[PDB]
Amino acid sequence: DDIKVAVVGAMSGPIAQWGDMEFNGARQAIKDINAKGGIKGDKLVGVEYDDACDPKQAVAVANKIVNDGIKYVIGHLCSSSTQPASDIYEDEGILMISPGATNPELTQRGYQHIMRTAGLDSSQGPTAAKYILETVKPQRIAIIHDKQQYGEGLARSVQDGLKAANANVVFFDGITAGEKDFSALIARLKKENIDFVYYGGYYPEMGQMLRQARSVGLKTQFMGPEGVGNASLSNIAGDAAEGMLVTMPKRYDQDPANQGIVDALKADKKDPSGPYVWITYAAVQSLATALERTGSDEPLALVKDLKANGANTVIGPLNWDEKGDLKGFDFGVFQWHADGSSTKA
Numbered sequence: 001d002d003i004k005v006a007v008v009g010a011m012s013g014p015i016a017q018w019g020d021m022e023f024n025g026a027r028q029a030i031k032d033i034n035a036k037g038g039i040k041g042d043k044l045v046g047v048e049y050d051d052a053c054d055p056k057q058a059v060a061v062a063n064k065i066v067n068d069g070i071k072y073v074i075g076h077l078c079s080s081s082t083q084p085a086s087d088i089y090e091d092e093g094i095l096m097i098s099p100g101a102t103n104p105e106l107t108q109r110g111y112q113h114i115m116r117t118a119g120l121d122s123s124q125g126p127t128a129a130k131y132i133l134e135t136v137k138p139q140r141i142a143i144i145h146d147k148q149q150y151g152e153g154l155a156r157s158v159q160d161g162l163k164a165a166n167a168n169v170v171f172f173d174g175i176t177a178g179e180k181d182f183s184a185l186i187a188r189l190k191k192e193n194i195d196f197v198y199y200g201g202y203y204p205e206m207g208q209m210l211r212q213a214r215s216v217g218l219k220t221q222f223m224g225p226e227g228v229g230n231a232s233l234s235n236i237a238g239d240a241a242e243g244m245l246v247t248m249p250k251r252y253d254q255d256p257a258n259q260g261i262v263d264a265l266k267a268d269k270k271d272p273s274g275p276y277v278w279i280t281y282a283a284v285q286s287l288a289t290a291l292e293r294t295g296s297d298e299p300l301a302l303v304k305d306l307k308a309n310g311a312n313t314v315i316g317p318l319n320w321d322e323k324g325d326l327k328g329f330d331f332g333v334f335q336w337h338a339d340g341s342s343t344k345a
């Protein structure tokens with residue numbers, strides 16, 4: 001019979017663009033696996049849920065998935081939506097592989113039914129710090145975040161890395177997501193002579209901050225995590241995007257092995273360049289690999305199978321640890337441009 005797979009992330013709300021990547025990836029993976037035969041003849045059927053990357057809606061989606069009888073979830077997208085959902089999946093015996101959530105705590109609580117194909121901010125944070133310390137070498141640093149699990153997690157991790165090396169972090173502060181007016185913060189960066197800012201959060205805020213910064217003449221170097229590194233960033237920020245630093249996964253679209261899938265997305269006129277197309281595609285491949293190899297429909301048998309034997313995916317040969325995290329997932333540093341391109345820093 002058909003095998004239902006829930007796919008969960010933002011299809012509404014302020015970061016729906018990251019969701020667009022996720023769904024585009026999941027859909028192409030499901031199509032490709034079904035075109036190749038399915039799972040010994042059984043077709044994968046994607047069942048899509050919008051959690052708006054909102055913790056309360058995520059919980060409602062998780063409860064709906066349980067009620068719907070679905071046993072496998074590729075989701076959720078954001079850390080603060082994925083973690084409360086994971087509590088329900090774990091309790092109910094449902095497999096959950098997140099292609100998006102990077103915050104460490106998800107997989108540090110002993111859970112057995114949870115995995116990711118996303119990286120960890122316990123790696124992303126230190127990488128930013130190292131680059132800041134060793135290459136940027138700033139004089140006066142401010143660290144800003146959006147008071148949310150992902151962004152504040154990362155802002156804390158970078159502060160910790162920088163303060164370990166006695167760097168001059170002048171202040172640490174939160175802003176409210178959705179904020180369109182950064183004139184107060186920007187005046188502070190100017191008056192306090194801040195030449196470097198790290199912002200833990202997502203592109204809508206980062207873009208507005210960059211545009212407003214350059215409009216008053218601030219020359220401050222900004223940096224953020226992969227959450228800011230979107231085609232939207234440069235549209236929102238304008239020429240102010242130029243020079244922004246971002247940590248991001250490898251450019252899987254440039255791997256020659258993916259040229260066929262790149263072409264598939266291109267024939268649909270979908271953008272293939274975002275890392276999360278591939279990271280989601282790889283979660284679907286992972287689940288499919290487990291289903292094919294085990295012949296089991298048990299979530300825990302599928303998770304045991306991936307942790308023992310791995311999967312070959314569009315983001316490379318995958319190996320997971322006993323907590324459900326990928327070994328060897330690294331983030332690189334990139335320099336953004338007004339036209340939305342980016343170069344290795």
Ligand SMILES: N[C@@H](Cc1ccccc1)C(=O)O
Pocket residue numbers: 018077078079080100101102103118150226227228276
């Ligand atoms: N990694 C982010 C979500 C994210 C998904 C896709 C791209 C960028 C960011 C988090 O844990 O919330």
